[PDB]
Every structure is written in C-alpha cells, then in structure tokens.
C-alpha cells in the first residue's frame, strides 16, 4: 500500500555551554535508516539500516552537505526566534523540523510536508496545496514573509513532488526484502488474578510490522473501549513492534470476553478467547 | 534524500 519518507531534526540550545546540539534522523515508514548528530565525531550523515549502506560515497557526501547546511541554519534560527520573541539568552530552547512525502500503492505522489515547531508547538508549516504557509503567530509571520519573498514554497513543492518521491521509490526497491515485508502479530492471552473476585485478561501482539494495529475487547460481542486498557505501541528493538490490550474481569465471566486483532499482515481479523 | 534547505532561514 502507501509509503512514506520522513526527516526529523531537533535543535536544542544550551546557553553558556556551547553551540546548540543538532540531531536528525530519517525514516521510510516505521524504519529509521539514517542519522546525523552534531556532537558525533564522524560529522557525516550515517547509515542506520543495512539497505542504505549500498549507496556510494557520493550519496553520503551530498547528504552530509545538505544536513550540515540545515544544521547550521537551524542553529542561526534558534537565535532569530529568540530575538523575534525577545526571550532570555539564559533559557534553553528547541527547534524541530519535519519533512517528507507520502506515496500511494502505485509509487505516485500523495502528500508533502515541511513544518517547524518551536518549543514543542507549531511555528510555520507548508499547507496541503504546497503553495502557502500556515504561520502560527506574529513571529512566524515575519518568517512567512521571508519565505514568500524567497519562493521557498514553490521550491519545496518541486522537491517533494520530485526528488523526495523518486528517492522513496529507490529506497523501497533497495530495501524491498525489508521495507516491503509484512509481519503478522504473534498473539496470545494471559490471565492475571487481582482478587478472589477479579482478574486481568491481557491480549498480546508481538513482533509485528508495520506498527499500525488494532486491538479491541468485546464482552459477548460488544465493545469495551471505555473499560479496556491500551498501551501505546512500542518498539521491540529489532524492527518489529509490540502492543497489548487488557480488561479487568469478574471471576466466572472470563469466557464472555473476546480479543480482536487487525493488522496488515493478517489475511483476516483474529479473535482470541480465554 | 535529506531536504535541500535553501532559504530556510527565519
């Protein structure tokens, strides 16, 4: 089906202790493949997935260049926002950037993104039509004016719809065996008594990919979304994911409940019973 | 491919 590429960078100032630290990572779907860390020795864009190690020195040279150029301007950007907001140089601040494109099953452009957040909230972001900016506030509007004058919008539009899309296609191929794999969740129930009168039923899903999954509980074929405990999906640490849903049950009524699991790699929704 | 950040200055 659809796929996505993403770059996330994070710049955090650390006043009186040096230059801001810049960390950037890149993803294809739910898999990281590169990183850059301004405090690292290599001072180059590094590989974080085997299927990208096959790009030659020119890739690394050009990519390093781009990420370095970005890291230096976001360094300067922190300073500009600081002045824009007239904030104290004593405080630490954060600038985050997200960039990338979505493509469809047919490898064709779907959506493009180019957004900044300052101190964890929206600053400026490119709209769905890739033609105009959404400026969160008065300061961002100064920037929206700079970017308008510099034609950043139309420039990035062309890149998203072009360079980014094509690169995504190349990656999906280079890493076909990994990126286009599908991992059904390996499931199972567990039973945990809390009292003589109650017990926890927990439904597990493990080692699945991508991370998109739906886990639901049903008391005799009926939703329990309010009484179900659901943990945020989580990395197994090996490119797969885990998740669990749970309901507290009055003793005796166990067999009343049912666990339902939907995942891309499951031909049909699974149902589990205690 | 990492974004080409010409003009990204605030």
């Amino acid at each position: 089906g659809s796929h996505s590429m993403r770059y996330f960078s994070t710049s955090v100032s650390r006043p009186g202790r040096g230059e801001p630290r810049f960390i950037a990572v890149g993803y294809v779907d739910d898999t990281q493949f590169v990183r850059f860390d301004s405090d690292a020795a290599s001072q180059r864009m590094e590989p974080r997935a085997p299927w990208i190690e096959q790009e030659g020195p020119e890739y690394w040279d050009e990519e390093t260049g781009k990420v370095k150029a970005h890291s230096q301007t976001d360094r300067e950007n922190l300073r500009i926002a600081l002045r824009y907001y007239n904030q104290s140089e004593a405080g630490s601040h954060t600038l985050q950037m997200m960039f990338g494109c979505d493509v469809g099953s047919d490898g064709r452009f779907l959506r493009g993104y180019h957004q900044y957040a300052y101190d964890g909230k929206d600053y400026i972001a490119l709209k769905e039509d890739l033609r105009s900016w959404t400026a969160a506030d008065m300061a961002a509007q100064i920037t929206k004016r700079k970017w308008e004058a510099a034609h950043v919008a139309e420039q990035q539009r062309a890149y998203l719809e072009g360079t980014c899309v094509d690169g995504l296609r190349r990656y999906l191929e280079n890493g076909k065996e990994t990126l286009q794999r599908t991992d059904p969740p390996k499931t199972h129930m567990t039973h945990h008594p809390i009292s003589d009168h109650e017990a926890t039923l927990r439904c597990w899903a493990l080692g699945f990919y991508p991370a998109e999954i739906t886990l639901t509980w049903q008391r005799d074929g009926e939703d329990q979304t309010q009484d179900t405990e659901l943990v945020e999906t989580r990395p197994a640490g090996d490119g797969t994911f885990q998740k669990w849903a749970a309901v507290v049950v009055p003793s005796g009524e166990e067999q009343r409940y049912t666990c339902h699991v939907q995942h891309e790699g499951l031909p049909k929704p699974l149902t589990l019973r205690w | 491919r990492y974004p080409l950040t010409f003009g990204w200055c605030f």
Partner: T-cell receptor, first 116, second 116 residues
C-alpha cells in the same frame, strides 16, 4: 568536462531564434543550472536559471529546454536582436560537501553573432 | 539584492608591483562573496569564496591573496605581481545558502595586464 559547451561560436539572422547547447556532469541529485550573458564590455549579466526539479524555465525571450535524463540544458533565445550578440555561459550549481556554500562551475562559453 | 561594484576596472602594472582590487556590494547584508578569473575570454575559474566577514576560502591554492575586512568590502591583492598574474578578475556576490537559492551576480570585472 564538468560543464560542456561544444559550440565555440554560432551565427544567426536577426529576428530568428537560436539555441545554445549545454551538457553537464554531476553526481548530485539536487542542483541548479544558470545561464549568463557576457557583454562585449566583458560584463557578466545573469539571464535565467533552471532547477533539477522544476519545469522548463522561461523568462522573456529566453527559454531553457531541460532534458534531465540526458543532462542537457540548452538555452534558446527567440526573436533575436542585434544586441543579443554576446558570449553566453552555462553554469552548474551544487551544494558543497561542507554545506557552507553553493559551488558554481562555468562552461567555456559560446559566442553568439546575430547577423543584420 | 541591489548593487556590486569593483575597481579599478583596467590595470597596467610592471612585474613586482603590489596589486589591490577592491569590491563593494549594496542593498543586502552578509552575502556570499567570490573572486572569479577569466583566462582568455572563455572559462571562469573560482579563485576565492567568502562565506562571511573575516572568512576567506579557496578550492585550489592561490598566489593572489584575498580578504574581507567588512561585511560588504572585498579585496583581491598581492605584494608582488608575477607576469602570470595577468588576467580578467571578476568580483561577485550571492545570497547565502540559508537566505535563499544562491544566484551569483557579477561586478564589472578588472583587466589586469602585468607587463614585463
């Protein structure tokens, strides 16, 4: 070899249109091509630019025929004028490995002589 | 994004004499600066590029010396000219990588004929 302008010299009747060829070599995936016109005074004036992700650039009588696969970026000027007579330069722009600046490389130029 | 001016435009000097070309830009702040060279009247070779005040860099080593004592003040110099220093020297400026897509714009250039 980085930027190649095979035509040392070209002539064309006024009012007609001419095409100045340009080929280039780059291992970058993102880049820009620039066209300049050098006046007989030796003044180097900027004309039009072409980005590797943009449609065919067009600006007044100047137009670029971007053929990305071939890495061909020929300039075409229509409705020639006598003062069009000048030397035309093709240039390649690549973000440096340092990220610090854009390295622009120039071809050797083509003299256009428009004929009265 | 306004004005660039270099001086003097024409130079005739004996071997051994000091050289001092100066360049200025107006209407823009903290621009990228460059010294380019045109041997014959064909290829342009980038000699120096300046990312910011006080900063001078070159791709390949040079005998001519360059400097940037102020944001909008650029210099190409020598303490003793070699007859090989003859040539056409162009000053140029551009927006910085961060400020936009760099498009190099040239000054008028300077003809330097070192005579034996």
């Amino acid at each position: 070899q980085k930027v190649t302008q095979a035509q040392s010299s070209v002539s064309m009747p006024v009012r007609k249109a001419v095409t100045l060829n340009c080929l280039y070599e780059t291992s970058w995936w993102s880049y820009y091509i620039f066209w300049y016109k050098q006046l007989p005074s030796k003044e180097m004036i900027f004309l039009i630019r072409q980005g590797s992700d943009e449609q065919n650039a067009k600006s007044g009588r100047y137009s670029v025929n971007f053929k990305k696969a071939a890495k061909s970026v020929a300039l075409t000027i229509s409705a020639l004028q006598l003062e069009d007579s000048a030397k035309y330069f093709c240039a390649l722009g690549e973000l440096a490995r340092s990220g610090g600046y854009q390295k622009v490389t120039f071809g050797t130029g083509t003299k256009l002589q428009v004929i009265p | 994004s306004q004005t660039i001016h270099q001086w003097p435009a024409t130079l005739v000097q004996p071997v051994g004499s000091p050289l001092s070309l100066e360049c200025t830009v107006e209407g823009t702040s903290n621009p990228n600066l460059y010294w380019y060279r045109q041997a014959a009247g064909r290829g342009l070779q980038l000699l120096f590029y300046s990312v910011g005040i006080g900063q001078i860099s070159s791709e390949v080593p040079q005998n001519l010396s360059a400097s940037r004592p102020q944001d909008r003040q650029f210099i190409l110099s020598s303490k003793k000219l070699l007859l090989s220093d003859s040539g056409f020297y162009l000053c140029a400026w551009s927006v910085s990588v961060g400020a936009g897509v760099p498009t190099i714009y040239f000054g008028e250039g300077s003809w330097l004929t070192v005579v034996e």
